[PDB]
Write a protein that binds this ligand. Sequence first.
Ligand code: CL
Ligand code: CL
Ligand code: NA
Length: 268
Amino acid sequence: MTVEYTASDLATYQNEVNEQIAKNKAHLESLTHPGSKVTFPIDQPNLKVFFFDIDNCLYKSSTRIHDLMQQSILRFFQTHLKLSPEDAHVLNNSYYKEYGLAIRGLVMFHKVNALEYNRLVDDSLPLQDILKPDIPLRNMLLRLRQSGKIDKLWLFTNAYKNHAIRCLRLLGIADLFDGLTYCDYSRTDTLVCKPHVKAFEKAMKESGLARYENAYFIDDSGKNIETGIKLGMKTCIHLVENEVGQTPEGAIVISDILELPHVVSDLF
Ligand SMILES: [Cl-]
Ligand SMILES: [Cl-]
Ligand code: NA
């Protein structure tokens, strides 16, 4: 939109975002529950690694998050003339599912500054209004961790690291993983993200996995699962919460991450 008070408006939007981010951080600082702090470093034999997508996987897809994200994108759209209405419409449908992949084209063609977008749209979101400590989840992941069958639980996400970290802390599962592979929005206009092969190569390198046959993978994106299968991962699990992209042949199909011990019980 072309407005009367452009400068005062953008400052106001940025100032509101500043205040909300400060509140978001203060909230995290207040947490004292198990799993409320990251216990692994960032950007660091027959090793077995289980890779986990985060969004819509470690928590159930939320229309509240979709709606909050849409409102956020709407405010961004109104203030950034480089985005078309179709760009914004597609983001409304896709960003809260695909994260970095959803902005990859926009970033490559310089219609969106990734860090600016992440701050105003993503880091601004009061995720604590939706994501709460999940004890059954914690207990399931701990069960996997302690079973003696898997060496590392590794996060593998298209979100930027702070979004990913917030999710782990809010859900009370931040001490259950050994590391995090995220989509780096910071200093390239060519984002590396799933389902692209280079994202998998990054996850392999960072986790220290040597052989795809020693990898396990759970994700809600059929196409991501497909890359995993074709790379030769041992078992890929396609999470489809609502059976309303297809499931690639060879994937196990589940509707809730708590189904995991009942579909790959050998690992538990
Ligand atoms: Cl592209
Ligand atoms: Cl584009
Ligand atoms: Na996901």
